[PDB]
Amino acid sequence: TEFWLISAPGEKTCQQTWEKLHAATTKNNNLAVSSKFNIPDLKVGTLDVLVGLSDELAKLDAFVEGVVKKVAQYMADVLEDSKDKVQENLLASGVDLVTYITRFQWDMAKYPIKQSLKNISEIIAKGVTQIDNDLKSRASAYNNLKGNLQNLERKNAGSLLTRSLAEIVKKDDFVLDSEYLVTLLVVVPKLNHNDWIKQYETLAEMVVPRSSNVLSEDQDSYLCNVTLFRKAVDDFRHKARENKFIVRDFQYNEEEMKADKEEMTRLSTDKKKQFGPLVRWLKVNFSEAFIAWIHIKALRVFVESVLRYGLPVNFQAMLLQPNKKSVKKLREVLHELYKHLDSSAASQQEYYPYVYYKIDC
Amino acid sequence: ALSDADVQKQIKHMMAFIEQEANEKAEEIDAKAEEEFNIEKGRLVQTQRLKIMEYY
Amino acid sequence: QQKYDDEDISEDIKFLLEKLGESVQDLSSFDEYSSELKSGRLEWSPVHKSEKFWRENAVRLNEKNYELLKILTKLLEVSDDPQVLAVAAHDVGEYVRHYPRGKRVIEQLGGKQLVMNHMHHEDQQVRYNALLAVQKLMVHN
Amino acid sequence: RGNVFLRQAEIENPLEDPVTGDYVHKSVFIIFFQGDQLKNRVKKICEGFRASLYPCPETPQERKEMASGVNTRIDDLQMVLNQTEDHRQRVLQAAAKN
């Protein structure tokens, strides 16, 4: 759905009915949704600086397209209760966002209008700035947490060759109180396992007899260990690397397993317990961000409608929703309607004969 | 895109703005006159008082 | 440009060149020019062709009331000698070239119309010298 | 947002363009405002396309009188141009003779 903000001189006292749903001037003959817009009560302040005010207002608007669409991108990336294509019903502080758009009410309570327009605009600017700073810091922290969890689950994965043996090797496999030996977990596949058990003596002198022991199984090969004097370890490694045997002088360490698994489970659970607050904070702050968004948009509408008609602030605004593929017909009929206001030229293009702004979800 | 009457009316609009500028400047200078009157009174009265105290 | 087998010639030409160099340095001065300006002697002095003099010491010509320039202005309407008039015209042109406010002071004195009278002098080369001075006067004008 | 009057003054006798030599007429249209930032924008755009913002019409008529005097000095300068072209003619003839 895509909406169209239109504002008019509002000369007639009854023109509001024409703005809302009057069937004579309705859009696409009662097939396009048209609603009135609650015009905020706003000051003027000045007009000399107002050109610059509108300028930097537009630049701030661009920048906040940036920040709020990044907020949308992140809340979509959370992928818990809200995703790109599912669970996309986005709530403007409790109700459907279109319900808040069609029931727009200026934020009189938070931002009184006795204050000049400039100071209110910078108030909103720095409020958005601190919203953005909080988003950056907190989302970076959550990116760090997610990266930590990803590294944890990555190091908790892999074959025997590419991962420390958690649920495979134990204490009894390695030599205990060893005075001269060292147990090397020389993995041997079944392609040449008889080879290993037959010429492990050829691979090295001064070796433990009957050391042909096999611990566990995996899909690439079979884990097995050899107990060997130091020179025997050198020779066995030297003549087994060529024999397509994985060499590994692993040291049994229950801590290497228990630590990693404990951090994995604790970080996952704490990440979820903190991601609850993430989604609450994110959806809330984005709802108020969109509230202030439509407020600054209404402020723009006011400024441009005013300068369009000079000093007096008399105008009537209205939401709209043209039918797809009926757009151009609406363009030309509204051109016919509004070209009599100026009667000369209001090549209408961007600056329409009506004060216009665009929004799309 | 304006005839003579319409551009004249826009000039009169800018003029209602200039008169508004004059009015807001007038009330602001009246306000600052209030505060400057107050501070002048405070300092001058207190200095006279202090001279009278030491003379006492 | 010609190399000779007698080294005495090369030493002598080097000596000639350097001593004529500091000869021009000796003739490069401002107080002798002012003494001649008071006396009205306006020859083809080396200082008159000295690019250095006009580039730097033109600030010196900004005297108190510009008396030397004023004397030149008087020499324009009293002295009819072509040579001194040409020298004075070139000097004024260079002075305005290096000091536009001095040109403004001259225009206060009305010297532009005086040199305009002098463009019609019987000595044609003096007409051209005054033309060069006027051409120098036309920057920002 | 043009919201101001316009002063018009069309002068014929096409004169060569200041920067290209186009023997082109003059047709002057004046539009100006009183907002300082609007003034920055208009002068930026006008210098971007085409403009001559050196002067500034104001109250002083003595400026107009001294400017007509400057037109008099411009005429005298044109006479100087006649003298200079005579000079280059005679010197180039002297050179080309031999």
Side-chain angles (χ1 to χ4, degrees):
Chain A
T1 180
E2 189 273 330
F3 290 96
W4 274 57
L5 294 165
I6 297 89
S7 303
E11 162 175 349
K12 296 296 185 193
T13 68
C14 48
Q15 210 167 349
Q16 282 89 7
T17 68
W18 280 262
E19 287 275 291
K20 173 66 91 179
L21 293 174
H22 187 193
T25 59
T26 191
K27 283 80 187 168
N28 296 134
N29 199 26
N30 285 305
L31 294 174
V33 186
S34 163
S35 176
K36 270 177 67 51
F37 182 77
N38 296 112
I39 286 164
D41 186 5
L42 298 177
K43 286 178 94 170
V44 55
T46 181
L47 305 186
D48 194 345
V49 182
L50 183 65
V51 58
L53 297 180
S54 64
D55 299 336
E56 63 253 7
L57 276 168
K59 320 303 176 268
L60 188 153
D61 292 314
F63 299 161
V64 298
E65 313 312 296
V67 308
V68 311
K69 297 320 146 192
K70 299 289 94 175
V71 176
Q73 189 271 335
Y74 185 77
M75 61 79 71
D77 266 333
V78 170
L79 295 161
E80 327 306 330
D81 186 74
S82 189
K83 314 206 189 175
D84 284 319
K85 308 297 186 180
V86 299
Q87 310 167 318
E88 75 259 32
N89 179 13
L90 183 59
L91 74 165
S93 315
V95 304
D96 189 359
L97 74 164
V98 301
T99 304
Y100 198 87
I101 285 158
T102 195
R103 282 275 68 69
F104 167 81
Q105 167 56 50
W106 179 259
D107 197 357
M108 271 314 327
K110 189 70 172 182
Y111 294 154
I113 190 56
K114 64 186 187 296
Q115 180 177 184
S116 188
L117 295 175
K118 279 76 66 175
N119 297 295
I120 287 161
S121 74
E122 288 103 12
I123 278 174
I124 297 161
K126 69 177 188 290
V128 170
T129 298
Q130 59 83 19
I131 284 165
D132 299 329
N133 264 335
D134 302 346
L135 179 68
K136 284 193 298 293
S137 65
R138 187 164 177 90
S140 303
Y142 286 131
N143 191 358
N144 309 340
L145 208 53
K146 283 289 285 294
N148 211 341
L149 192 60
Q150 286 304 126
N151 309 134
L152 281 149
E153 64 193 86
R154 273 194 57 74
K155 275 76 178 176
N156 275 295
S159 63
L160 299 178
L161 170 59
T162 69
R163 187 183 34 78
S164 75
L165 267 58
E167 303 295 310
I168 311 292
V169 76
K170 68 186 289 294
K171 296 183 288 295
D172 275 329
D173 298 340
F174 288 157
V175 60
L176 60 94
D177 189 358
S178 181
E179 313 173 6
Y180 71 109
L181 298 159
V182 178
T183 304
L184 190 71
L185 304 170
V186 192
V187 188
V188 175
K190 300 289 94 175
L191 309 164
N192 56 0
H193 182 84
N194 287 330
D195 196 358
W196 160 59
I197 72 190
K198 273 309 315 166
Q199 64 95 36
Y200 67 90
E201 167 60 22
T202 315
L203 291 176
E205 299 173 350
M206 183 177 177
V207 309
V208 170
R210 292 185 271 105
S211 69
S212 53
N213 298 320
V214 189
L215 315 180
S216 183
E217 186 273 340
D218 69 83
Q219 293 304 305
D220 301 311
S221 60
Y222 283 69
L223 168 72
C224 48
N225 64 349
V226 192
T227 310
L228 299 172
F229 185 59
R230 298 178 290 288
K231 91 204 159 186
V233 170
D234 189 358
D235 303 338
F236 201 94
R237 193 263 294 165
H238 184 90
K239 284 290 187 187
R241 53 192 276 192
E242 299 173 4
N243 206 347
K244 311 173 302 316
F245 298 166
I246 291 154
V247 167
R248 38 174 300 144
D249 191 9
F250 187 80
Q251 186 71 39
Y252 79 90
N253 288 296
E254 313 91 357
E255 65 264 5
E256 277 171 22
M257 161 156 38
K258 195 45 158 179
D260 168 36
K261 274 163 191 181
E262 281 298 317
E263 284 103 10
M264 207 275 286
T265 183
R266 161 151 33 76
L267 272 289
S268 89
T269 313
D270 293 346
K271 186 206 76 158
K272 288 181 181 180
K273 272 298 300 155
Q274 193 184 1
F275 271 22
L278 168 53
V279 298
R280 304 156 211 167
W281 181 78
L282 187 57
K283 74 185 188 192
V284 163
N285 281 113
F286 186 79
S287 75
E288 290 89 6
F290 187 75
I291 290 158
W293 188 275
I294 58 174
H295 291 316
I296 60 172
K297 285 171 61 189
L299 167 63
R300 297 169 62 69
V301 165
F302 176 85
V303 165
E304 272 78 2
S305 56
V306 165
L307 59 89
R308 174 60 186 281
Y309 310 130
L311 186 58
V313 310
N314 175 23
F315 62 95
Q316 300 179 28
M318 61 80 71
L319 292 169
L320 176 64
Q321 195 274 311
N323 282 107
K324 275 73 70 177
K325 185 255 173 197
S326 312
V327 60
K328 61 181 76 63
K329 296 181 176 66
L330 185 49
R331 305 289 60 71
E332 60 84 9
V333 299
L334 294 175
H335 177 257
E336 161 51 57
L337 192 148
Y338 292 109
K339 68 188 297 305
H340 295 285
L341 306 190
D342 200 9
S343 72
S344 183
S347 189
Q348 279 68 22
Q349 62 194 80
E350 281 299 288
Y351 273 13
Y352 295 102
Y354 42 92
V355 188
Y356 172 67
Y357 278 141
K358 186 266 184 181
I359 184 63
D360 206 330
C361 297
Chain B
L2 299 165
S3 74
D4 178 31
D6 307 332
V7 66
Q8 277 175 13
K9 201 168 195 286
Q10 302 323 303
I11 289 153
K12 303 308 171 285
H13 291 162
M14 182 277 288
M15 281 286 218
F17 170 56
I18 282 177
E19 301 322 279
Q20 159 56 30
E21 174 181 341
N23 289 300
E24 55 84 9
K25 285 190 83 64
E27 59 84 8
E28 284 311 310
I29 196 164
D30 277 330
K32 82 188 267 290
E34 187 71 38
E35 288 89 6
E36 293 179 354
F37 164 88
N38 303 331
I39 193 70
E40 296 267 300
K41 278 290 177 140
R43 157 183 30 70
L44 175 48
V45 165
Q46 196 40 46
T47 54
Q48 301 331 112
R49 292 280 82 70
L50 289 172
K51 271 190 304 310
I52 287 158
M53 294 298 102
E54 57 84 21
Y55 171 40
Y56 270 118
Chain C
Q1 311 311 316
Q2 294 96 52
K3 326 303 154 205
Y4 296 159
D5 309 341
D6 186 18
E7 190 276 331
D8 301 336
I9 297 169
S10 61
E11 190 277 331
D12 285 355
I13 184 172
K14 172 174 187 291
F15 191 68
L16 268 294
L17 288 160
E18 59 85 27
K19 77 171 167 272
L20 292 169
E22 67 257 14
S23 295
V24 174
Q25 296 302 126
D26 291 331
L27 302 157
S28 169
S29 175
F30 63 91
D31 62 358
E32 56 173 2
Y33 208 104
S34 183
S35 294
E36 303 290 2
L37 282 174
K38 303 155 195 177
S39 301
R41 325 290 186 174
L42 302 186
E43 284 285 337
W44 295 273
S45 78
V47 177
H48 165 281
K49 298 296 199 297
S50 169
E51 91 291 350
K52 311 188 299 186
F53 163 73
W54 293 120
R55 210 174 58 258
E56 283 90 6
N57 294 269
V59 63
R60 184 59 39 75
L61 304 186
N62 186 339
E63 303 285 347
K64 297 289 104 177
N65 314 318
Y66 313 88
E67 291 293 329
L68 291 167
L69 182 65
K70 289 178 71 61
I71 286 300
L72 293 173
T73 318
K74 303 311 295 185
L75 290 179
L76 291 174
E77 59 252 23
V78 296
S79 87
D80 289 324
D81 167 29
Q83 193 276 327
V84 301
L85 286 174
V87 169
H90 166 276
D91 298 325
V92 166
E94 273 280 21
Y95 175 79
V96 299
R97 193 167 78 84
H98 298 288
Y99 189 56
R101 296 164 194 169
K103 192 167 68 187
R104 188 199 56 80
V105 171
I106 286 293
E107 295 288 10
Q108 280 180 294
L109 299 169
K112 189 264 182 186
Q113 189 44 56
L114 192 54
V115 298
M116 185 63 72
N117 300 330
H118 287 289
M119 331 301 278
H120 303 296
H121 216 300
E122 293 92 11
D123 191 302
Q124 304 306 282
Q125 184 37 247
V126 171
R127 311 175 89 209
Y128 183 64
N129 295 120
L131 182 63
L132 294 174
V134 165
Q135 286 171 0
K136 293 171 189 179
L137 290 170
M138 294 298 102
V139 64
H140 194 247
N141 188 88
Chain D
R1 302 202 36 79
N3 47 46
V4 287
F5 291 136
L6 188 151
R7 174 74 103 189
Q8 63 275 7
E10 273 70 22
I11 301 304
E12 281 303 317
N13 319 316
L15 192 150
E16 280 96 351
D17 188 73
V19 295
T20 49
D22 185 3
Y23 209 70
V24 68
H25 45 270
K26 296 296 198 185
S27 168
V28 168
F29 290 74
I30 309 309
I31 284 284
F32 201 72
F33 307 82
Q34 300 305 303
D36 55 351
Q37 186 168 3
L38 193 64
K39 272 193 295 295
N40 303 331
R41 303 290 79 67
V42 64
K43 73 174 153 53
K44 159 167 156 94
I45 293 157
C46 290
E47 192 56 38
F49 170 72
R50 282 191 297 118
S52 171
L53 296 172
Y54 199 90
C56 183
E58 294 301 327
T59 314
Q61 305 158 333
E62 56 258 16
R63 154 183 46 72
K64 311 174 181 186
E65 300 150 13
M66 61 79 71
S68 55
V70 166
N71 192 357
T72 318
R73 280 83 65 193
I74 292 161
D75 302 331
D76 184 317
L77 184 60
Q78 191 60 232
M79 184 274 287
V80 174
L81 274 296
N82 281 277
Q83 195 278 335
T84 58
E85 59 80 20
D86 180 76
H87 171 276
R88 62 207 59 240
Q89 189 277 330
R90 62 93 171 170
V91 300
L92 70 85
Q93 193 91 62
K97 265 194 286 291
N98 44 16

